[PDB]
Design a protein around this ligand. Structure first.
Ligand SMILES: Nc1ncnc2c1ncn2[C@@H]1O[C@H](COP(=O)(O)OP(=O)(O)OP(O)(O)=S)[C@@H](O)[C@H]1O
Ligand SMILES: Nc1ncnc2c1ncn2[C@@H]1O[C@H](COP(=O)(O)OP(=O)(O)OP(O)(O)=S)[C@@H](O)[C@H]1O
Ligand SMILES: [Mg+2]
Ligand SMILES: [Mg+2]
Ligand SMILES: [Mg+2]
Ligand SMILES: [Mg+2]
Lengths: 265, 254, 274, 252
């Protein structure tokens, strides 16, 4: 009955957050879930770009009061409903906290036959990212095997734990050149978090470095749709299996979150 | 998932007696105690043991919501009402109708919201933001704080009248440092809750239980429950020995 | 004396190489004999220190929280580049207000020992931290890669700066280009869009090639310019620094918040006053 | 640094006369004109002909500084003043002491700031944000606006007393379209400066200049200068005809 909500994040730019959000959403749809994908990079939208879509309206039109969320939904590959964001619209480059809250609350109107909401967050760890991450039920950090990505992911985990008491994080290694590289990267991250924090990290697995992803970005088609048998796409199906076995939320927590009414039952 | 608080300690029996004091009334409840003591378990237990058992249980954390956003969270709003009100929506009070509203960290509630909370307690009415049509609500308030409300009254940060309205038979939680003999029982309970919500499974051996009984736990219980979650992710369905604990919880020689 | 050149390295899109460019451009400029300062303006998610393998004793968090002054956090890096390190996840640094950004930019007036060298490494995105530092700088250097998302985000940043702030002149650097002709074609893709929709002046700086030596350098937490001095990427950084060093100096203050405004006035008592 | 007022038109001739007429006084100047008409160039030329020529020239754009920052920018602040006030620092009034402060887009100044500006005009003193210590400065004010300040006084958005204090010596900048006979001269000036700063080089043939003179110039001069800079980046050292000038400059 509750809707699973996954915030795809990781702090560091360019580690594959949007590629992961897009292709995980597709892989979940392919597994048989009803999936919605919110582009929460609100003023620098990329989900539509990666799928080659040209929305007539976006969240800018909702935020500015010209239409409702249901008006902007797009029926994407495998029936993933896409909520498209804006690309440089003044209105969307700084939403107030009240506008964030109103937007997150507005999703309760389109929740009807929905199993999973995937939220693609912007780069960084500012208040907007953190509001979307906190509003979700699961936090999926995308990490690459470079010191800057490990440091930024750790900084995000530290902020969410220190300032908001969050303790459970899902870690996906992306662009690994071997499965052992993904495992070794998870080991590097857990070394730092074990040393300084008390948090629970689950290793979800790895998305391999794959030229098919680069080709798909150039084609502006999801690698999962355009190269369904590439290593990256097979890896997304495996990740989707892991994600689908996550426990569903039971109770509302006390703060701003998606679909609170359904959590109250 | 209603269980009487587990444990054999004196402290927890006092807490159970405080709960029995208010369990058969429909009055507002106040839960005092250090952060992480277990107040939401108490509130949901009270909810189950009341006529409102089948109604909604709605939590709000005043310390986890910005001051400027709390009014809309609590009372809801109408679509035209303010810049971010893009839809009309019921707030937490309206969602709690016929049930219980768990108002946690009320020591962080701003004074205007304390005024409106008192209005709900006394008149059983409220208005959504951007509307002044009066609405009725039949909700039981269970409030909680880890702060010294009497010092807040003296600092001017908490309203005296609200204090006298809420502070009648406060449930006073005991920190874990006063309940060491309960830790083993607590661990079983936490595992059981984890299994019940399909979140994982573990089993401790006696050496690990002993090390955890030797650990300090300033974060109280929540800290214990966090460690149980963490171990169920480190070693899913595994057996937890001292070597399976994170290094800081190992107390073989101390 | 002379005005300070101030370059904001930006681009909107994440992972296009903004920090690698800021760091190695700063080192290359220092190699030419310039006194260089490098500000990590990713204020809550510092990466300059990470790329350089440094562990600063103090950061901008110490300034914001009133424990020291801005001068006290300057860190001597490779080639003598002086670094103003940012914070990583520090609660005081992860949601700075516009007034805090402005107070910080103003605080930089306390500095008079650099030439042509405030390199500002901006965060991803086009929010207020980015835009305030980009507007406070004298040259805007957009780092772009040959993917639709980088082109789209760079365009959106150019469009915001033009539409909302009247900015018309932008420098464009192609990074991770698999050949020089690919970077030139990339510049042309971007200018096809900006020519169609805007009235802006885009200047092509050139290309930093895709180079394995950058990836190795990032793993080692050393600047590619120093760790691999003869790789093609480091030679390209030397070339870009020479071009940057030939850019015209700022002449006059514009009327808004910008770095080192008291030196733009070009008056001894004004320059002495702050 | 002083740019020259070029052109043969009667409007620019008058402006040049006025620079000399007001050279002997520190009277506040108010320059009215559409956006991009050259108001700061006039203000610098006025300063250069004033008794303050060797003092500083400090611009402030009340339209490009957020309302909450403008007081700190104008008056300075002490370190304890507001959350982001991490240093003590003189503001633009102090930086302009002995010289000229150019308040551009004065019609974007908030009303509380208008009261504080009026006080500094009258009493020639001010206080830093976060302080009550009195500061003396001797600054000559040149303000500029593209808005109808009198209707703003009627609407209650601008103060009448401030307006009368600023408007001692008024100057009206003609829009570019009322002085297209100047464009050739302006082009030579723009290009010349562009070359002397090594930012590029361009020439126009006579047909291109005719087409440009046929233009509406919503952005006045500023738009002309942006066009020069754009074509120079576009056709380095080129000769601009009519084909190189193709939408909205294209009239032939
Ligand atoms: N599995 C992969 N294999 C190969 N290349 C990949 C893979 N995943 C991502 N990439 C590359 O990484 C680039 C950046 O991916 P994005 O999804 O835009 O990352 P991001 O983390 O969302 O970046 P931003 O700008 O912070 S939103 C893509 O355009 C691809 O070039
Ligand atoms: N010229 C290059 N050749 C090869 N790899 C490069 C090159 N430039 C950048 N990279 C790679 O791109 C990664 C991202 O570089 P960064 O400098 O972190 O980009 P960034 O734009 O600052 O990303 P942010 O700040 O998180 S938005 C580096 O870690 C390298 O792996
Ligand atoms: Mg993205
Ligand atoms: Mg960076
Ligand atoms: Mg100075
Ligand atoms: Mg005062």
């Amino acid at each position: 009955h509750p809707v699973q909500v996954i915030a795809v994040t990781g702090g560091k730019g360019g580690v594959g957050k949007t590629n992961v959000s897009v292709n995980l959403a597709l892989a979940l749809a392919d597994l048989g879930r009803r999936v919605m994908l919110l582009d929460a990079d609100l003023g620098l939208a990329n989900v539509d770009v990666l799928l080659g879509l040209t929305p007539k309206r976006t969240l800018a039109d909702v935020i500015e009061g010209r239409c409702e969320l249901r008006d902007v939904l797009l029926l994407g590959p495998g029936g993933v409903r896409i909520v498209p964001a804006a690309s440089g619209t003044q209105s969307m480059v700084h939403l107030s906290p009240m506008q964030h809250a109103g937007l997150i609350q507005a999703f309760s109107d389109i929740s009807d036959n929905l199993d999973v909401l995937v939220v693609d967050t912007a780069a960084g760890i500012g208040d907007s990212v953190v509001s979307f991450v906190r509003a979700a039920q699961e936090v999926l950090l995308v990490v690459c095997d470079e010191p800057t990505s490990i440091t930024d992911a750790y900084a995000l985990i530290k902020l969410l734990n220190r300032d908001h008491g969050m303790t459970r994080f899902r870690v996906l290694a992306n662009m690994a050149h071997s499965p052992q590289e993904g495992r070794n990267l998870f080991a590097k991250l857990t070394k730092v978090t074990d040393r300084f924090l008390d948090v629970a990290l689950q290793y979800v697995g790895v998305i391999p470095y794959d030229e098919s992803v680069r080709k798909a970005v150039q084609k502006q088609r999801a690698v999962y749709e355009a190269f369904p048998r590439s290593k990256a796409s097979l890896a997304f199906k495996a990740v989707a299996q892991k994600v689908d076995s996550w426990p569903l939320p039971a109770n509302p927590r006390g703060h701003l979150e998606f679909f609170v009414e359904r959590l109250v039952q | 998932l209603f269980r009487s608080l587990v444990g054999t300690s004196r402290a927890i029996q006092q807490v159970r007696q405080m709960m029995q004091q208010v369990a058969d009334t429909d009055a507002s409840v106040l839960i005092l105690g250090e952060s992480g003591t277990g107040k939401e378990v108490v509130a949901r237990n009270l909810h189950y043991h009341s006529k409102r058992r089948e109604g909604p249980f709605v939590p709000v954390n005043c310390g986890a919501i910005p001051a400027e956003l709390l009014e809309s969270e609590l009372f809801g709003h109408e679509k035209g009402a303010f810049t971010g009100a893009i839809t009309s929506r019921a707030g937490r009070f309206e969602l709690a109708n016929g049930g219980t509203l768990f108002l946690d960290e009320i020591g962080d509630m701003p004074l205007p919201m304390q005024v409106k909370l008192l209005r709900v307690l006394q008149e059983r009415t409220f208005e959504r933001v951007g509307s002044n049509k009066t609405q009725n609500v039949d909700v039981r308030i269970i409030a909680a704080t880890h702060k010294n409300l009497e010092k807040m009254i003296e600092d001017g940060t908490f309203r005296e009248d609200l204090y006298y309205r809420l502070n009648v038979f406060p449930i006073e939680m005991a920190p874990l440092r006063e309940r060491v003999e309960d830790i083993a029982l607590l661990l079983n309970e936490l595992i059981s809750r984890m299994e019940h919500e399909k979140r994982g499974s573990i089993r401790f051996n006696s050496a690990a239980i002993m090390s955890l009984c030797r650990h300090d736990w300033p974060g109280n219980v929540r800290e214990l429950a966090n460690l149980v979650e963490r171990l169920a992710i480190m070693h899913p369905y595994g057996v937890i020995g001292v070597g399976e604990l994170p290094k800081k919880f190992r107390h073989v020689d101390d």
